[PDB]
Amino acid sequence: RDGKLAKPRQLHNTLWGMVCPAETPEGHAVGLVKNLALMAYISVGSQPS
Amino acid sequence: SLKQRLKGKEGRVRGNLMGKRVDFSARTVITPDPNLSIDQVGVPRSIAANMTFAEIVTPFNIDRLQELVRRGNSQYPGAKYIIRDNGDRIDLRFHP
Amino acid sequence: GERPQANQKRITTPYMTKYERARVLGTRALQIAMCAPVMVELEGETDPLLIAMKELKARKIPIIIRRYLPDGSYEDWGVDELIITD
Amino acid sequence: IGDKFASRHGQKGTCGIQYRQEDMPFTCEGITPDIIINPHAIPSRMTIGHLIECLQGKVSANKGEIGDATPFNDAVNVQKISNLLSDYGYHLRGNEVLYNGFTGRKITSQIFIGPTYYQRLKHMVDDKIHSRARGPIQILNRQPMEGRSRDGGLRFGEMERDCQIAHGAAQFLRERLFEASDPYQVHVCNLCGIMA
Amino acid sequence: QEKMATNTVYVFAKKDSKYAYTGECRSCLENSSRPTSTIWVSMLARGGQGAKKSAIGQRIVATLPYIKQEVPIIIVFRALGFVSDRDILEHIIYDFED
Amino acid sequence: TVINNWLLIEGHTIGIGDSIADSKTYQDIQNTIKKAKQDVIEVIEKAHNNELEPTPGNTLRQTFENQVNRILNDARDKTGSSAQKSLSEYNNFKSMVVSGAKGSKINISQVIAVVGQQNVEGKRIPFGFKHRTLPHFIKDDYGPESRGFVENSYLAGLTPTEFFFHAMGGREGLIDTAVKTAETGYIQRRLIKSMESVMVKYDATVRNSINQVVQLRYGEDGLAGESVEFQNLATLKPSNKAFEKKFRFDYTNERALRRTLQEDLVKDVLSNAHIQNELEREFERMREDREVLRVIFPTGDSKVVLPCNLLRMIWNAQKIFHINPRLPSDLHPIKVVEGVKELSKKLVIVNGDDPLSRQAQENATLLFNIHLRSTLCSRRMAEEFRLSGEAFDWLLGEIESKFNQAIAHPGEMVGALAAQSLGEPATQMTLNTFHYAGVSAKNVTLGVPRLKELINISKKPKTPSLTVFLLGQSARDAERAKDILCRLEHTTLRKVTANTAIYYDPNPQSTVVAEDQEWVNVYYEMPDFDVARISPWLLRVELDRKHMTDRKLTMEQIAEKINAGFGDDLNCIFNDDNAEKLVLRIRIMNSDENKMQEEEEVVDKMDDDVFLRCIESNMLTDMTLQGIEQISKVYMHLPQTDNKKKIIITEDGEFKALQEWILETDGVSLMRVLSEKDVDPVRTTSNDIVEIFTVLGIEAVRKALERELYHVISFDGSYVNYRHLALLCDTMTCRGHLMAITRHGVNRQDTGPLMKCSFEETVDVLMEA
Amino acid sequence: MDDEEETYRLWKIRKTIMQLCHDRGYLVTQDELDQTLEEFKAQSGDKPSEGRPRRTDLTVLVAHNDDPTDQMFVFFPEEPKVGIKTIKVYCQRMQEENITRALIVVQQGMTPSAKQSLVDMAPKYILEQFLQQELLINITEHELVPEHVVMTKEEVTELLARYKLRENQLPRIQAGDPVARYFGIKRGQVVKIIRPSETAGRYITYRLVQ
Amino acid sequence: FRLNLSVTTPYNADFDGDEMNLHLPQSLETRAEIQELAMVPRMIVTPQSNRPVMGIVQDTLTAVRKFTKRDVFLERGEVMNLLMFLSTWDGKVPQPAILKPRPLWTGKQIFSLIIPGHINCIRTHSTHPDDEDSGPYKHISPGD
Amino acid sequence: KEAIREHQMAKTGGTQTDLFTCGKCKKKNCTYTQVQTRSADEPMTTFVVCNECGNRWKFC
Amino acid sequence: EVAYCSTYTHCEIHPSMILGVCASIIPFPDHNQSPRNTYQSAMGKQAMGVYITNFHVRMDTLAHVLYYPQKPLVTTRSMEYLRFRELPAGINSIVAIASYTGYNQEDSVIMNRSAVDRGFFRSVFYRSYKEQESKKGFDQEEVFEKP
Ligand SMILES: [Mg+2]
Ligand SMILES: [Mg+2]
Ligand SMILES: [Zn+2]
């Protein structure tokens, strides 16, 4: 939405270990739909006080 | 309103003139069969139990056409509906 | 007389096309199905698609092909004057 | 026959045909196969992993132990696994010969037999069908209903009408738009063309 | 869903229109209301006037929030209590010996 | 059915045993890859030592990525050739490749030997993880296993560092497939809304929906396309000596019982001067169709497509009548000549009365008449084929029967056929890895955005191109060919200037610069009478010497251009190109009359401090030495031997290649390029369409647009008939103006009222009508 | 520039305008059509010094055609921007000489007050307007330009009275085509086009000038 | 929808689940029009690229080159079984290519029974081993 | 003059594998083209287009 | 002995951690083609098989269970923690690669009629309906009766 016109997705180097590369739908939503790796923790937020 | 129904945004153009629905059709799942001929297409038994075809009654084969009418609508080799000359569309299922 | 000009000079080769073969086989099959006198001699068949096909090879179908020209005129053609292509 | 299936390796395949046990080939003791897949479906998509499960399942069946399928191991799944299969009394490459189920002649080639785990998709072949001769017709435009949920007709896309022009069938296209679809007639005056 | 990391100054390439560079950077609150507040600092790509200054390519005129047109960024330093070029240059870089 | 039933009793399976190579061969496969790794390290070791010679045409980093491309390509092709000989014919895996299915030589190495490089969008794997690709590798490591290349195959597994790289290539072909699939329903839908107007009528001439003659006959021959077969003309003979010996033959043969066998009728017409004139004039007509053939086919390709294959119809008659060289065949000489003239009279498809209609029939079937006369010649029917009189009589009745069936059926709705003839090859692989290299760059966009833009016909294309040809000495010499490059290239003045500084020079004769003191002092012939009240602020510029040797420029051509741009009120001076650097000082020309507060006027015209800043920023952009502004400055040479162009004739008659020096630009200014010297204005074409209608006209758009669409199909791999490429150009260029035939340009057309409303307007059109 | 290289520009535009008239139907001598660069500076003494009306001596008057008309005065102006003063003088030389057609070539452009009288001028008179930027090179020598042959009145009437080809059925073309301006065609005439075909050999088509 | 493999090639469809529609005419004049126009015995060679669309690949391609292999020699009981499998047959058993000792047949004699005795196709072969020209041109060695 | 002369010699590429033999000029000036990966029902084939004399054919 | 660098700070837990839920089901994902591995995640999601334990308390419109949920033989140790061997999606059918009669062309297989009669992938179509008995106005409402 916020940014278009000639902006492909393809594959990025930071996807290693964080997002499963071989897990995407076969329809028109390929590449746009992301997932999560097997062993990965999501940050929840903390106070750096 | 009145313009949207005819402009083309799913109105009387794209949704009717450029995209309507017809009758007498079938759409299943294709399966490979090299043993058949180049024109022998697959026809299911459940689909054939509904696809009808209005055939005129000719005196050259009036005996064969009468056999399908006498048997009724109880099996495949039979007739379902009939149409007379004036327009009488008589059914054979609930016929006395 | 101001439009039909088939009795003077004809430009199209006298040969039946694939479009005219479909209409002749379709129109004749509808007439025979409505109890019509058979032009040829019947040998024992009831298929309306086969009766019109047998009469096409015998060139005995009394029909005249009226090919409308795009300029406004039209030309006439007969069954004997058109050789079928298979 | 006709239902949509799939596989664990990615080579999905619907139910083509089903024969009896006597009409299918067999090995020596009487091992009749359950699913026959196209041998040409492997080089067309480079599905080499499908042959690994078909060979690993045979070695684990003769031993009786759940073999690990780690894709990053050092056990060498090429020579060590092949040599272990030949010790039980079979071929080391996993290839076996079968017999003809109709005449009894030995097969020239070697059928690579072995167990393979599959799945089953949710695509009923008897639920996706849609056929009707003459049923309920709408009143807004005198057209069939939506689909099978309300007993209607099939979709007529624009690509079907565009290609029909290339065939030159004017009478067949008129039937799908006027005759066998929306049959109606309107009386038109002679002095004027206003439909009233 | 997924969004871009806020409170981080990033440099992008925007050479499709009359601009050349774009420094998009958000400024959302921690846990209060976070009204987005995206700081748009772009660099134009125009070059050549005629007879006035003939140095429009060295301008910045960033797009401050709410603001209609583009205003220069050096005017904001005059409102922050710094009216000398020695103090403004100190905010940019801590070593002006280059 | 018989083949399918035999497969049950035979069998053809596949497994692990069908993917094992030789034991001694597999040892050499892994050793060959290790030898290629030492060659890559040798290039890296020689690159960091500052001693490697870059490739002329690129930089240093662009050369390293090119040198390693041929190393890894030869490494994956040498190991694949060794695995081809190891697999025997008994292996069922090779039978799938030899038969011709979804598998070739590259599919064998990717599962046994080595996969290869997994490039992305043509280019190699970029850096997006702190100048790296994966954290498993160290910084500044240009290894092959860390840049997408997979050293293993689908048999011994893949390393974790290579499994992530190989997965990127599969995602490129999967995401683009879903995007290209959605474009099929939008491009094909647009073509059928405008091409459905034209159709084939009954009077040969192709018309439309509003009764307008578009063409004179379908396919420029009045024949169908189903009977067209890839034939072989076999007329463009290199050596003219063999062309006369093959066709022409005289009766002055050896006395050794010649002209007595095979044909038992030659003995009756021995030494006949009446029949000699008929055979001598026949060869004269063959020579007329040969010299003009060079102009009709300047490319030199006799293998074209024509209906009614004469190579099979003549040979088929030899089997029925049992024709063999060991049998005398009596052939009549006059019957062969009369048979061609009699058969040519039956080829009339239009009116036949006035002499003007006969001129439109010979040229319409000119290619078919030459192919029929050359094949059914007087000697070809008696030496290569050796046909008798009965074999030639029945052959004339068979060609006329097949020609009648090859005639296009009048009434074929070509409106829907021509629209699908272009959208069908577009669904193949138009935009999928720019494989077109040709020792050049990635010029000329080819793919999905090219077809969507050519139909919409915009004002300026995305990537314009214009190939420039040369003749004279430039077609064989490299020094004269590069001399024109200096005039055509848009050399900006900013690139020439290396440095610019503002100095304070009070006395112009005694400057403060020590290294440039004697240069401005020895020059005394300059009228230094009005230089005492000029601008004291000095604006000295510096010219780069490395740029002079790369573009070939002088010092006398720079000062004569600066003073001719701003005006006469601008002084310029320079020094010779033999000192330490190229400098150039500029001053003003003060009239010394009324340029010193003559009329006061508290407005201030222009301050001296800011006067030099405006000129310094206006000369480095607006002022151009030489070249066109709208042609960029990129250039690249293409091999003339590669493409089939320039086929000249010699004293012998053979077709040889003529190499020269060609270049390509990046502009559409066709009027200024053709106006240059030495450049040949005959074969100079371009990919633009708008400038063709302005410079040349609509008569050249039909010929230029057809060649652009033919180059797309020639590279995609598919094929398109010639009768459909000429119809698309004639349909759009029918009104005499380059206008979009789609929705963007329909109000200006003169079509029916019920047709313009079908473009998603309806109400907007019916209200006007 | 404007020294020695300018001689090749004046020599190239002279060979182009001579082939423009010979392609229509005029007869030009072989010596005038076939010449070299050194021969152009010897027919009447070219470039004696610097600064001279070089565009005035280029006045030619051909008069060789089958149609007994001939007399076509061709003159080149001297000033770049041809104003209304030059048009009033150029129109006086054609009244005393009583020519048939004119051919003027303006360097840059003209004035709006003079471009209106150039098209109208007189109902029984036709004046041609060219340009130096388009006559420096011959656009008819390109490989994508077919053979263009003009037609007469009797050839158009006979063609439309054969296949019953109506006037609206024939394709149209605009007046902005430089090909139509190369021969000076008028609105309402058919121009024969000879296009070399590939799968045929020679394709012939006809178009109407709208 | 059981169909032949030769029909799936022009449609370029897959049997994985790609649904295909099948209409039904309700007129006598329309059945004769489709039978003489929109049919697969007639729509073989397309005018778009003067080449046929019928393709014979996958399973119906490997068994063709293997049946004509030099290492194929059918027995006597397998010839009569394949003769009955023919849809049409005049009723003339061909002469065996090998008379002694055992009456056997070659791998190309049975395949030649389907092709009529008045059509041929040479020159075009498109192989893979051996060598592209040069080789077979030496001493004129046709075949294989 | 020798530095700018060698600029139009190597260009940006090379190709020319020198394997296939052309049947029109008894020379081996042919190149390869890795085209057709999956396609549809059409089998993949490495197209061979000869540089000189203008020749091209199919590998299968 | 042979190492270009010896300054490592972190290390991966297991090379198979890059896969996901459906990606860890296919054995040896490296030996197969890279785009073909992405189709498995779309097939395993829209497939049949058991998913929980209590089958009599759930009433979903789309529910398919298996009579004999047999665990796969050749499996990975990564799916042991994801609870996959207890709730599979099929059985270990013996698949023999063969041509048979050429009826398994283009994404199709040939099965045994006698094997299906014994319990080869026998599922039950569970579909639940619901009808709300709401009001229809002031004095208008629905009444469950038997007219
Ligand atoms: Mg498909
Ligand atoms: Mg398929
Ligand atoms: Zn060659």
Coordinates of C-alpha atoms and ligand atoms in Angstrom, one line a residue, chain D residues 45, chain F residues 102, chain H residues 5 8-9 12-16 18 58, chain I residues 38 40-41, chain J residues 105-107, ligand 2:
Chain D
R45 CA 10.1 -32.1 -12.6
Chain F
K102 CA 10.7 -32.5 -20.6
Chain H
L5 CA -3.9 -37.9 -25.0
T8 CA -5.0 -32.9 -24.3
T9 CA -2.0 -31.5 -26.2
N12 CA -2.6 -27.7 -22.9
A13 CA -4.6 -28.8 -19.9
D14 CA -3.6 -30.9 -16.9
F15 CA -5.4 -33.8 -15.3
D16 CA -4.5 -32.6 -11.7
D18 CA -8.3 -28.5 -14.2
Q58 CA 5.2 -38.6 -22.6
Chain I
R38 CA 9.6 -25.8 -18.7
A40 CA 4.1 -26.4 -21.7
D41 CA 3.7 -29.6 -23.8
Chain J
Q105 CA -0.6 -39.6 -17.6
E106 CA 0.0 -36.0 -16.4
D107 CA -0.7 -35.7 -12.7
Ligands
MG2 MG -0.3 -32.0 -19.4

